[PDB]
Amino acid sequence: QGLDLESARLASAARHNHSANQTNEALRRLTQEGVDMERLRTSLGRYIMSLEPLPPDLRRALESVGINPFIPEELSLVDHPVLNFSAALNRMLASRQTTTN
């Protein structure tokens, strides 16, 4: 006896695991995956604004790390995890090259 396996497995199904590591992890993973940092920064910045969306390449890459690109406009693209992703992205590349004028 001891059939209480539902209660045990749902707690493990939920789990606690997340960090700002996942942001920098996504950046470096997409780099190793075959997505260029600059092209990523373009398609991502476009997604933030009223512009052309990111390709299913950028989509599959992000979703494979666990960061969903396509958030509905009920969040108004504010509450989405893709902001913190884009933040670390643009400031990383800005620090790499430069921000002149």
Protein backbone atom coordinates (compact mmCIF):
# COMPACT_ATOMS: atom_id res chain seq x y z
CA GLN A 1 0.00 0.00 0.00
CA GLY A 2 0.94 3.72 -0.35
CA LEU A 3 -0.94 4.84 -3.51
CA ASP A 4 -0.44 8.63 -2.98
CA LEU A 5 1.76 8.95 -6.09
CA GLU A 6 -0.44 11.69 -7.68
CA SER A 7 0.26 14.07 -4.73
CA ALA A 8 4.02 13.29 -4.89
CA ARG A 9 4.48 13.67 -8.69
CA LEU A 10 2.46 16.96 -9.09
CA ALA A 11 4.84 18.64 -6.58
CA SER A 12 7.83 17.49 -8.70
CA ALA A 13 5.92 18.43 -11.93
CA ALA A 14 5.59 22.03 -10.67
CA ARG A 15 9.19 22.31 -9.24
CA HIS A 16 11.15 25.55 -8.38
CA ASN A 17 13.87 26.38 -10.99
CA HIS A 18 14.51 29.81 -12.68
CA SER A 19 17.07 32.69 -12.69
CA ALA A 20 18.54 35.66 -14.65
CA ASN A 21 21.08 32.96 -15.71
CA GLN A 22 18.36 31.71 -18.19
CA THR A 23 18.56 35.13 -19.92
CA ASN A 24 22.39 35.06 -20.53
CA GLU A 25 22.04 31.30 -21.14
CA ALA A 26 19.55 32.01 -23.98
CA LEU A 27 21.92 34.63 -25.54
CA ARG A 28 25.00 32.31 -25.56
CA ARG A 29 22.89 29.21 -26.57
CA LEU A 30 21.45 31.00 -29.65
CA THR A 31 25.07 31.97 -30.53
CA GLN A 32 26.13 28.23 -30.37
CA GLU A 33 22.81 27.19 -32.04
CA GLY A 34 23.65 29.23 -35.21
CA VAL A 35 21.75 32.50 -34.54
CA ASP A 36 23.86 35.70 -34.98
CA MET A 37 23.75 38.11 -31.98
CA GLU A 38 23.10 41.20 -34.20
CA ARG A 39 20.33 39.51 -36.30
CA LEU A 40 18.74 38.24 -33.07
CA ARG A 41 18.89 41.84 -31.63
CA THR A 42 17.18 43.20 -34.78
CA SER A 43 14.34 40.59 -34.91
CA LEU A 44 13.83 40.86 -31.10
CA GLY A 45 13.71 44.70 -31.05
CA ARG A 46 11.21 44.48 -33.96
CA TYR A 47 9.01 42.10 -31.89
CA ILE A 48 8.96 44.65 -28.97
CA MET A 49 7.58 47.39 -31.27
CA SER A 50 4.90 47.63 -34.01
CA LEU A 51 7.24 46.07 -36.66
CA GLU A 52 7.94 42.83 -38.67
CA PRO A 53 8.05 39.72 -36.29
CA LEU A 54 11.04 37.41 -35.59
CA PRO A 55 11.46 34.28 -37.93
CA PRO A 56 10.48 30.65 -36.76
CA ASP A 57 14.32 30.23 -36.41
CA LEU A 58 14.39 32.87 -33.60
CA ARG A 59 11.12 31.39 -32.24
CA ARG A 60 12.32 27.72 -32.03
CA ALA A 61 15.69 28.86 -30.55
CA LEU A 62 14.09 30.93 -27.73
CA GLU A 63 11.38 28.29 -26.97
CA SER A 64 14.08 25.55 -26.89
CA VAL A 65 15.89 27.52 -24.11
CA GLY A 66 12.44 28.09 -22.46
CA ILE A 67 11.89 31.81 -23.21
CA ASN A 68 8.63 32.12 -25.20
CA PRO A 69 8.80 34.96 -27.86
CA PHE A 70 5.07 35.06 -28.87
CA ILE A 71 3.23 36.57 -25.88
CA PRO A 72 -0.40 37.87 -26.52
CA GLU A 73 -1.27 41.62 -26.35
CA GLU A 74 -3.30 41.07 -23.11
CA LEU A 75 0.19 41.55 -21.48
CA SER A 76 0.58 44.49 -23.97
CA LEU A 77 4.15 43.07 -24.44
CA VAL A 78 5.04 44.50 -20.96
CA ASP A 79 4.85 41.53 -18.49
CA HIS A 80 6.57 39.13 -21.03
CA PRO A 81 10.04 37.50 -20.11
CA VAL A 82 11.29 38.68 -23.56
CA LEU A 83 11.92 42.25 -22.17
CA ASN A 84 14.67 41.14 -19.70
CA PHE A 85 16.07 38.94 -22.49
CA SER A 86 16.21 41.88 -24.94
CA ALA A 87 17.61 44.17 -22.19
CA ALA A 88 20.62 41.93 -21.50
CA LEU A 89 20.95 41.38 -25.29
CA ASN A 90 21.17 45.06 -26.44
CA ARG A 91 23.35 46.19 -23.44
CA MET A 92 25.72 43.20 -24.05
CA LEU A 93 26.19 44.09 -27.76
CA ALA A 94 26.40 47.85 -26.94
CA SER A 95 29.21 47.03 -24.45
CA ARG A 96 30.94 44.75 -27.08
CA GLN A 97 31.13 47.32 -29.95
CA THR A 98 30.18 50.88 -28.69
CA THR A 99 27.38 53.52 -28.43
CA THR A 100 28.75 56.61 -30.25
CA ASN A 101 26.38 59.69 -30.25
